[PDB]
Amino acid sequence: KNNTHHFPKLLILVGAPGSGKSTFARYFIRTEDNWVRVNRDDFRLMQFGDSLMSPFYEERITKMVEASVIALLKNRTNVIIDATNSSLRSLQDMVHTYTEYADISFKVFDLPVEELVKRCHVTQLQYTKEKFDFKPIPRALKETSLTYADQDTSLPKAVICDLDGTLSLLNGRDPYNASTADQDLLNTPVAMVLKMAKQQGYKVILLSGRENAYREPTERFLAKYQIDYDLLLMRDTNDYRKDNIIKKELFLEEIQGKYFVEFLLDDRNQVVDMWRRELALPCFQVNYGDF
Amino acid sequence: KNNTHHFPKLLILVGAPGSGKSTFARYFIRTEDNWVRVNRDDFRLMQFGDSLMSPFYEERITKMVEASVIALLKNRTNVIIDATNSSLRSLQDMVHTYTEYADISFKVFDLPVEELVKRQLQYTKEKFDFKPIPRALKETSLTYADQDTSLPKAVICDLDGTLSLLNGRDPYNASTADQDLLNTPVAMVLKMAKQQGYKVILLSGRENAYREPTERFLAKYQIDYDLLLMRDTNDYRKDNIIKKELFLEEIQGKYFVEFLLDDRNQVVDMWRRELALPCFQVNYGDF
Amino acid sequence: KSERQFAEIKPMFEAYFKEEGLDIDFQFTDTHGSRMDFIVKELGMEYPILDIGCGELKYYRRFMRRNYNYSHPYFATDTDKSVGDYAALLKERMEADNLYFFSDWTDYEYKNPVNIILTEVIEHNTPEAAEALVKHCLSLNFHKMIITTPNSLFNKYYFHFEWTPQEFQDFIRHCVGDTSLEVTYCGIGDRINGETPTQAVVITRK
Amino acid sequence: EDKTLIKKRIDWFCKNKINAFSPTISPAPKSVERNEIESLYEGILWFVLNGVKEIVIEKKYMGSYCDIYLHRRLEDTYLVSRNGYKINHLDQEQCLRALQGLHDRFSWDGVELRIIQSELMPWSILGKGLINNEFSAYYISHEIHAEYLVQSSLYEKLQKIQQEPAYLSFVADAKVLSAKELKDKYPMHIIRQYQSIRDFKFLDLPHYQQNIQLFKRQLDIFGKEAAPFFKPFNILKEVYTDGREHFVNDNLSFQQINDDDFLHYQFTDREDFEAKYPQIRAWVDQVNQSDEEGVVIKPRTAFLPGMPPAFKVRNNDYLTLVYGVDFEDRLQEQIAKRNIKGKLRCSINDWAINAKLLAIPYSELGEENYELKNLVLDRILGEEIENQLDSRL
Ligand SMILES: Nc1ncnc2c1ncn2[C@@H]1O[C@H](COP(=O)(O)OP(=O)(O)OP(=O)(O)O)[C@@H](O)[C@H]1O
Ligand SMILES: Nc1ncnc2c1ncn2[C@@H]1O[C@H](COP(=O)(O)OP(=O)(O)OP(=O)(O)O)[C@@H](O)[C@H]1O
Numbered sequence A: 001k002n003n004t005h006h007f008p009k010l011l012i013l014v015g016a017p018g019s020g021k022s023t024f025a026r027y028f029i030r031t032e033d034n035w036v037r038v039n040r041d042d043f044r045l046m047q048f049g050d051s052l053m054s055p056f057y058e059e060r061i062t063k064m065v066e067a068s069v070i071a072l073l074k075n076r077t078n079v080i081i082d083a084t085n086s087s088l089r090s091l092q093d094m095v096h097t098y099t100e101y102a103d104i105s106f107k108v109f110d111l112p113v114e115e116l117v118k119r120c121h122v123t124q125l126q127y128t129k130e131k132f133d134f135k136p137i138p139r140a141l142k143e144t145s146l147t148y149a150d151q152d153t154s155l156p157k158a159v160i161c162d163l164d165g166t167l168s169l170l171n172g173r174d175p176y177n178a179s180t181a182d183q184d185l186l187n188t189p190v191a192m193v194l195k196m197a198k199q200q201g202y203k204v205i206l207l208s209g210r211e212n213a214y215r216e217p218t219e220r221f222l223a224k225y226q227i228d229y230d231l232l233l234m235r236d237t238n239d240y241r242k243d244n245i246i247k248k249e250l251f252l253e254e255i256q257g258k259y260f261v262e263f264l265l266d267d268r269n270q271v272v273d274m275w276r277r278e279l280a281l282p283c284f285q286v287n288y289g290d291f
Numbered sequence B: 001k002n003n004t005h006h007f008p009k010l011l012i013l014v015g016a017p018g019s020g021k022s023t024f025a026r027y028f029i030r031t032e033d034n035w036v037r038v039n040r041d042d043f044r045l046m047q048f049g050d051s052l053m054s055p056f057y058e059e060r061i062t063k064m065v066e067a068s069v070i071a072l073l074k075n076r077t078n079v080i081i082d083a084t085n086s087s088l089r090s091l092q093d094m095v096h097t098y099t100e101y102a103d104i105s106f107k108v109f110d111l112p113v114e115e116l117v118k119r120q121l122q123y124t125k126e127k128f129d130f131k132p133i134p135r136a137l138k139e140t141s142l143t144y145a146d147q148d149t150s151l152p153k154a155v156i157c158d159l160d161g162t163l164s165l166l167n168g169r170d171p172y173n174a175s176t177a178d179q180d181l182l183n184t185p186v187a188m189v190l191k192m193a194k195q196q197g198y199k200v201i202l203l204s205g206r207e208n209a210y211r212e213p214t215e216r217f218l219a220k221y222q223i224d225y226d227l228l229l230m231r232d233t234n235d236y237r238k239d240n241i242i243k244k245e246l247f248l249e250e251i252q253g254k255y256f257v258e259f260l261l262d263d264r265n266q267v268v269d270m271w272r273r274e275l276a277l278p279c280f281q282v283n284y285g286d287f
Numbered sequence C: 001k002s003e004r005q006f007a008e009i010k011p012m013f014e015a016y017f018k019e020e021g022l023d024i025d026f027q028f029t030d031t032h033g034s035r036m037d038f039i040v041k042e043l044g045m046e047y048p049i050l051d052i053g054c055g056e057l058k059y060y061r062r063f064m065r066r067n068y069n070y071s072h073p074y075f076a077t078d079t080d081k082s083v084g085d086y087a088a089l090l091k092e093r094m095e096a097d098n099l100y101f102f103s104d105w106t107d108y109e110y111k112n113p114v115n116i117i118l119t120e121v122i123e124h125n126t127p128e129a130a131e132a133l134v135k136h137c138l139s140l141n142f143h144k145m146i147i148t149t150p151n152s153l154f155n156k157y158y159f160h161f162e163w164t165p166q167e168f169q170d171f172i173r174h175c176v177g178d179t180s181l182e183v184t185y186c187g188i189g190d191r192i193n194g195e196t197p198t199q200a201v202v203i204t205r206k
Numbered sequence D: 001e002d003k004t005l006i007k008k009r010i011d012w013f014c015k016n017k018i019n020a021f022s023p024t025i026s027p028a029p030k031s032v033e034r035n036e037i038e039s040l041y042e043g044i045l046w047f048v049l050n051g052v053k054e055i056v057i058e059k060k061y062m063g064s065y066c067d068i069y070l071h072r073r074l075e076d077t078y079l080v081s082r083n084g085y086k087i088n089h090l091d092q093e094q095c096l097r098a099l100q101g102l103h104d105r106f107s108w109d110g111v112e113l114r115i116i117q118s119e120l121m122p123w124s125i126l127g128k129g130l131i132n133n134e135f136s137a138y139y140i141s142h143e144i145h146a147e148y149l150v151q152s153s154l155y156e157k158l159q160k161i162q163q164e165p166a167y168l169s170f171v172a173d174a175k176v177l178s179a180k181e182l183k184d185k186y187p188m189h190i191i192r193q194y195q196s197i198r199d200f201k202f203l204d205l206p207h208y209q210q211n212i213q214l215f216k217r218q219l220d221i222f223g224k225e226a227a228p229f230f231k232p233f234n235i236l237k238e239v240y241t242d243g244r245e246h247f248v249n250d251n252l253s254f255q256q257i258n259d260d261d262f263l264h265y266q267f268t269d270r271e272d273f274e275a276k277y278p279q280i281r282a283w284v285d286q287v288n289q290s291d292e293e294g295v296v297i298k299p300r301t302a303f304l305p306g307m308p309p310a311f312k313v314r315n316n317d318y319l320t321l322v323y324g325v326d327f328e329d330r331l332q333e334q335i336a337k338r339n340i341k342g343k344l345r346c347s348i349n350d351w352a353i354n355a356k357l358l359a360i361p362y363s364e365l366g367e368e369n370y371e372l373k374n375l376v377l378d379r380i381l382g383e384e385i386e387n388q389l390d391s392r393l
């Protein structure tokens, strides 16, 4: 080390109603330099209402709060956050959700209940059981501990390639109508992997989210660009379930336990997540997904 | 094919202050099922702002309006927007930014200014036409940069998070990098890489100071490599720009890049959207 | 109100009806669902199913809070414009993710094997277009098909058409004719001197 | 509240061009003082205490709330109910016939509609069967029961036992010793019998009958059938052909839209009333002897902010239809369980919504007026909530 390196800050205001956290913040964002406030209550005011809502709404408000904080923290904007939360399951969670993006800090607002209900309510004390110790928590990463899955190394070496948008760019084509798929263009770098792949003992298995009905226009595309493959695995005709569901079935039924997958090449996120997160397998992501 | 897929609905309420859009959306939320409001004004209020602020706040607000809308659409949730803009196309950005994500609908609240100030003018004024757009897509090919296909064909590979698993090391103190771990499938790529006419080139953010413990890690796992470009010791600036530089000095126009294995986002973007090179991204890297 | 409670009263009511000259086997669940139970049990959860004739009741049941892990998709069809529109409203992502609803039979393309449900249907709407629908279904690549209709002999006991068994049995015979199906019959619901209120066939392809 | 089916209802309120809903009405506040459960006095005094200088007194009619949408073309008028619905299951001929009383009292040059709130008469035009199933059934039961008690030797034998020395011995040495012993009165054998007697509710049989008969008499007046007619009482607003509208805001409109029926009009401001109360009470008691449900009191101008639209005073005779045959007797106990608030809380909201509704111009009603739709649902909630009240007020 030796070096200076700084990340934005997330300042979590922790405390009860009336305890003066929104007042501090109004002063704070007005005098400090690069700060944005995020209030949960202000959010559920776009949806019209007083500050408790449907477990539908509150789950959606969470989805938004988190997105925004991350959105900003990513932008190197400091974020103060008005935790009406106050618990521990909240706090520890809050910390999990955030620290990796920025340096967390805390500011408590304790205040005698005799004084607290004099900010005019509903006479209700909260879970203030001075826990956790509110020591600042610098940014932490957690994950360079990559651990795959214990696949039988007796089974024959094999790689796995997505077709749509990984070995075969659409070039305008309709995503769901892969009949016109012999016009498709080659993502040569992936093509080049599959080449050198089969130069070592590697079985090359094509696994695709195309209707099986479009098998023929596919085999055309493949032999047109001279792709040397072992299996061609395709989605059942009239299936239409999500990609990762039908690909995973395909994986477990066929590939699984019959081969030893050395890695996978794919494009869209939904699928990459499944491969990595559910099946615990190395998968390289070739372009950008987020379809 | 005929399955058809169904996407969330984003509904822009176009009108000018007083119209009726926020009163519609009030009824529209309480009566419809899966719908959330996203109003730019309530975000200002979150910063303690009357209306209109520093271009700073305005810009940072925007970054979290798009955040909160996309975050919702991806949770498959219909989203309504009180477009307090409706400008001579401030609508098109709004449409270009989202159409990737949802079926876009409009509902213009037109009202004569004599009635509109039941509390001046507001120009219509357009060839816009409010046709409900489906979902979009695009990014329909890859502009892989014209490369001199005569230079020795070679591949490029990050160390940290790609080939070298930290196993909980200090990512800034690479002195112990020799007791680090191998991401075998990444290494398996470099193995077959060599055996084909490829020069394997390494390229790191490790300051040169920690080169000994690097070369040891490589020898230990018997990694076969041709170059090893690193960070100038005590350079300490953005990981991203260092590699960018090293490339344009050492590798650019001196080899032929077939692809790059990398891990951290900041970098993968640089490869794909600045230098227009192919870049396979092993595993997740959000920092 | 309880199954256990029902267990103690059952023999009593049953014995009472013997002396009146009636063997009755009383059942707690109610003909419907007494039936829907039988179907779910019989088919199983290992093939995707084809739900011919549906307000949605059979679909929810195939999902039961993930308790039955339904891996496949779910094919469902119906003529009622009502049902179709309700099927639509479910593709406003009130779940129904693996629901393909189709109206024209030339829209069912799935070339893979399927388990089939002819809920009530072959009477309580169409008549001898039954010969049609049942014969069309038999051509489909299926594993197991279940058909249910009223017993008509059961009408004695209450207060479109309706076949007796034998009437029904003939219908099935003259739809399989000569193909290598295996076919077994049985009844569902309260039984009185042999007759239940709904008839059943379990057709399995050898 | 089911959203997919409230969405339904609201669309109808819009489709049908309805321009107003309705108030609930709270009874007059207690008078533990005068033992009148709905106090003519304490209900007028409540108003002067809150700023009325002029109030009006209308007879309260026994029918069903019906907003009349009088069009100049009498042929195309319609009737909306207590809540948001059109009434069209009446003889729209026979109805229009009764409405011409009202129609011919006006001048419709340049006036195209006149929204008038009235009582559709009589009770059984929509309420019969609720009359048959509930009310006449309560009556008959009690009347049958009373026949039995009178014809039957029952009450007699009980009274004879209640005299014997075996009993009484029991009721004394048991009023003083507590569930004891055992009460070696043969088990339980006696402890049952003599305990069940004594705890038997005797009834002043004649008084039980007189009570039953008052119920009958009342039910006979209001509850008998039934050639449709109207008792109009307030003009909500007048709608001109020339676009413009006139928000009436006057309950005294009354003496114009029908009802040459005696109302009255007093200026009781700042307790020169009390000396004014004896005349208003003197006439209302003429009204009650005169076979009516009771009386309603309203601020002379229909809408006042933060106010209820009215107070009702149902006489005690009529109230025996509401409470048992024995309201007369257990008068005090129920003055106690009573709280005019809650009603009054809703009674102000309903009216105050109703006026922001009436506020929307006739031309604008529809499914594209989301201010309409908001006010409605708001009003609809008010229903869902107000219905959960005592439901005897
Ligand atoms: N030191 C103080 N002295 C007097 N009044 C104060 C002080 N601090 C805050 N207040 C007042 O107390 C009231 C509540 O404060 P504030 O709005 O900060 O509550 P809060 O903690 O944000 O509650 P919520 O969770 O509802 O946002 C405000 O009206 C504020 O003006
Ligand atoms: N159709 C309508 N008829 C009558 N009044 C209406 C109607 N629509 C809205 N209003 C009233 O107009 C007032 C302000 O309108 P509204 O709140 O809808 O403006 P807005 O669309 O929110 O504009 P902005 O959000 O840009 O400020 C509110 O008091 C509301 O009750």
Ligand SMILES: Nc1ncnc2c1ncn2[C@@H]1O[C@H](COP(=O)(O)OP(=O)(O)OP(=O)(O)O)[C@@H](O)[C@H]1O
Binding pocket: D023, D024, D025, D026, D058, D059, D060, D061, D062, D063, D064, D065, D066, D082, D119, D233, D296, D312, D393
């Ligand atoms: N002169 C009048 N002015 C206003 N309302 C009257 C008049 N005469 C009769 N009514 C009726 O009396 C109603 C309230 O009295 P009543 O107790 O008979 O009905 P209700 O069932 O209590 O109505 P709610 O339960 O909605 O209060 C009014 O809604 C109206 O229908």
Ligand SMILES: Nc1ncnc2c1ncn2[C@@H]1O[C@H](CSCC[C@H](N)C(=O)O)[C@@H](O)[C@H]1O
Binding pocket: C032, C052, C053, C054, C055, C056, C057, C058, C077, C078, C079, C080, C083, C119, C120, C121, C124, C125, C126, C133
């Ligand atoms: N030829 C046909 N094709 C598709 N549906 C048919 C049909 N003939 C009759 N039907 C349908 O069969 C249905 C039976 S109702 C289904 C019963 C069962 N309780 C369940 O919920 O599943 C009706 O809705 C009717 O429209």
Ligand SMILES: [Mg+2]
Binding pocket: A162, A163, A164, A165, A166, A266, A267, A268
């Ligand atoms: Mg793909």
Ligand SMILES: [Mg+2]
Binding pocket: B158, B159, B160, B161, B162, B262, B263, B264
């Ligand atoms: Mg890296």
Ligand SMILES: [Mg+2]
Binding pocket: D061, D062, D063, D064
């Ligand atoms: Mg009445």
